[PDB]
């Protein structure tokens, strides 16, 4: 990872800042796998601005850039979060980027992810995804409504419940605009696919044919929804035109075809099929043509997620007898196992393709994990009151 210094932000008010901003920026950069922040334990100093920054102390220590900041109170009850990125190495002392934000204590972490998104894109030329969110299902220890569809920042904080249920909920999927979630609920007794508007809580009932309805995915252009129905005896792909409520069948047969994911063209799909025996990933244009297998490595591959630029995909894969999240380059065919935990499942990619969120078993339970797509960084998300599954990473917001 690219060395970088991130200094704890300056605090000027009721002793003890409400949020460690520097800590959030360091975690974000580290989380992407693109940077290696100096441990707070080795910082050669704790400067407060684009002046107290002495390059040789850093510019020397293999760090050609430091982040400094200041968190100051407002009479309005809000706060002012400001950061400055100093260019040691090359032109020591220079300020490469800086900014300041007025936010409520509720949005302190958001201001922290805004700084990191700015610093990340200025230094890497890749748009940051630190202000994104994730959706997931938590089975708590409450008895009436054990299942809860929740949403939080990609890093697990600031979570909120979208919906509580007495019956199982699964496979949330974000609309491309980030305003709605599609998911499967068994509340009515049988499987049902619904779309819920986050702001409103309004729920649109989409499909509840006989049998199982599940694994939804919105096309990137917003005009269609793909999913799998097993009303034919086995799962097959259907796509619904959201502007006309129209539904078309895409695959047919005795084989199971499910877990669709869209290529950037909103016309092609990668999906899981047990056609060849053990699950493998195939691709098909929904307008026509025969599906083509695309995973030839590994004994088994499934539940793919194609990146936003279509350069690669991540999936659940079996290599050397073990199942982990792996990624496959869609141009070269190169494959690389990214995770190393137990029973890795349902991987979802950040909108900039730099991180993947997935679940793994934990004792009798389940938790979420993040692994950078270059494979460098691995971390468990914050624990919550319950076992967690089916994470879905939101598009840019």
Q: How far is the CB of 269 from Yb ion (least distance, A)?
A: 12
The stretch near Yb ion (CB under 5 A) out of 18-26, 245-253, 297-305, 354-362 is 297-305
The stretch near Yb ion (CB under 5 A) out of 187-195, 282-290, 298-306, 375-383 is 298-306
How far from 278 is each of 43, 103, 275, 298, 345, CA to CA, in Å? 51, 52, 8, 10, 16
The Cα 253–Cα 86 span in angstroms is 60
By C-beta, is 153 or 303 nearer to Yb ion? Answer: 303
DSSP string, 70-88: EEEE-TTS-EEEEEEEEE-
**Which residues sit directly before a break in the chain (C to N > 2.5 Å)?**
none
By C-beta, is 107 or 136 nearer to Yb ion? Answer: 136
Q: How far is the CB of 160 from Yb ion (least distance, A)?
A: 23
By C-beta, is 19 or 303 nearer to Yb ion? Answer: 303
**Contact status, residue 184 vs residue 144, Cβ threshold 8 Å:** no
By C-beta, is 10 or 366 nearer to Yb ion? Answer: 366
The stretch near Yb ion (CB under 5 A) out of 15-23, 121-129, 183-191, 296-304 is 296-304
By C-beta, is 35 or 390 nearer to Yb ion? Answer: 390
40: helix, coil or strand? helix
**Contact status, residue 358 vs residue 339, Cβ threshold 8 Å:** yes
303 binds Yb ion, rule: CB under 5 A? yes
Q: How far is the CB of 295 from Yb ion (least distance, A)?
A: 14
| Residue located via tokens 């990609």 | 154
The Cα 246–Cα 207 span in angstroms is 11
Q: How far is the CB of 338 from Yb ion (least distance, A)?
A: 15
Q: How far is the CB of 209 from Yb ion (least distance, A)?
A: 21
Q: Is the dihedral of CA 249, 253, 259, 263 positive or negative?
A: negative
Q: How far is the CB of 302 from Yb ion (least distance, A)?
A: 9
Pairing of β 257-262 and β 247-249 = unpaired
Centroid of chain to Cα 236:
26
By C-beta, is 118 or 303 nearer to Yb ion? Answer: 303
Q: How far is the CB of 250 from Yb ion (least distance, A)?
A: 17
| Residue located via tokens 């220590």 | 61
The Cα 54–Cα 46 span in angstroms is 10
DSSP string, 49-113: STTT--HHHHTTTT-S-EEEEEEEE-TTS-EEEEEEEEE-SSSTTEEEEEEEEEE-GGGHHHHHH
The stretch near Yb ion (CB under 5 A) out of 99-107, 151-159, 270-278, 301-309 is 301-309
Give the per-residue contact string, 250-289, with Yb ion (x = CB under 5 A; - = no).
Answer: ----------------------------------------
The stretch near Yb ion (CB under 5 A) out of 80-88, 223-231, 300-308, 330-338 is 300-308
Residue with smallest beta-carbon separation from Yb ion: 303
By C-beta, is 240 or 315 nearer to Yb ion? Answer: 315
By C-beta, is 118 or 344 nearer to Yb ion? Answer: 344
Q: How far is the CB of 333 from Yb ion (least distance, A)?
A: 21
Q: Which residues bind Yb ion (CB under 5 A)?
A: 303
């Amino acid at each position: 990872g690219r060395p970088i210094g991130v200094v704890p932000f300056q605090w000027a008010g009721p002793g003890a800042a409400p949020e460690d901003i520097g800590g959030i920026v360091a975690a974000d950069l580290r989380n992407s796998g693109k940077f290696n922040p100096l441990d707070r334990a080795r910082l050669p100093q704790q400067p407060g601005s684009a002046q107290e920054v002495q390059p040789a102390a850093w510019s020397a220590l293999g760090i050609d850039a430091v982040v400094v900041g200041q968190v100051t109170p407002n009479p309005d009850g809000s706060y002012n979060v400001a950061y400055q990125l100093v260019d040691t190495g090359g032109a020591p002392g220079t300020v490469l980027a800086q900014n300041s934000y007025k936010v409520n204590k509720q949005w302190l972490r958001y201001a922290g992810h805004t700084a990191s998104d700015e610093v990340f894109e200025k230094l890497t030329g890749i748009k940051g995804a630190f202000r994104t969110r994730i959706a997931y299902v938590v089975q708590t220890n409450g008895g009436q409504f054990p299942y809860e569809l929740r949403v939080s920042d990609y890093d697990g904080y600031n979570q909120f419940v979208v919906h509580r249920s007495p019956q199982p909920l699964m496979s949330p999927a974000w609309s491309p605009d980030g305003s709605k979630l599609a998911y499967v609920t068994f509340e009515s007794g049988r499987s049902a696919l619904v779309i819920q508007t986050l702001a409103n809580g309004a729920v649109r009932q989409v499909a509840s044919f006989p049998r199982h309805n599940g694994a939804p995915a919105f096309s990137p252009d917003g005009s269609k929804l793909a999913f799998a129905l097993s009303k034919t005896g086995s799962l097959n792909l259907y796509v619904m035109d959201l502007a006309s409520g129209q539904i078309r069948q895409v695959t047919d047969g005795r084989s199971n075809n499910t877990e669709p994911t869209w290529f950037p063209d909103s016309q092609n799909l990668a999906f899981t099929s047990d056609q060849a025996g053990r699950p493998q990933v195939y691709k098909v244009n929904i307008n026509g043509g025969a599906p083509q297998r695309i995973t030839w490595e590994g004994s088994q591959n499934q539940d793919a997620d194609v990146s936003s630029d279509g350069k690669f995909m991540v999936m659940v894969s079996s290599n050397g007898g073990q199942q982990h999240i792996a990624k496959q380059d869609l141009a070269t065919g190169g494959v690389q196992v990214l995770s190393s935990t137990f029973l890795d499942e349902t991987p979802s990619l950040a909108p900039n393709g730099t991180m993947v969120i997935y679940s793994s078993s934990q004792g009798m339970g389940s938790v979420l994990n993040l692994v950078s797509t270059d494979g460098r960084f691995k971390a468990r998300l914050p624990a919550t009151d319950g076992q967690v599954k089916f994470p879905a990473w939101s598009p840019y917001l």
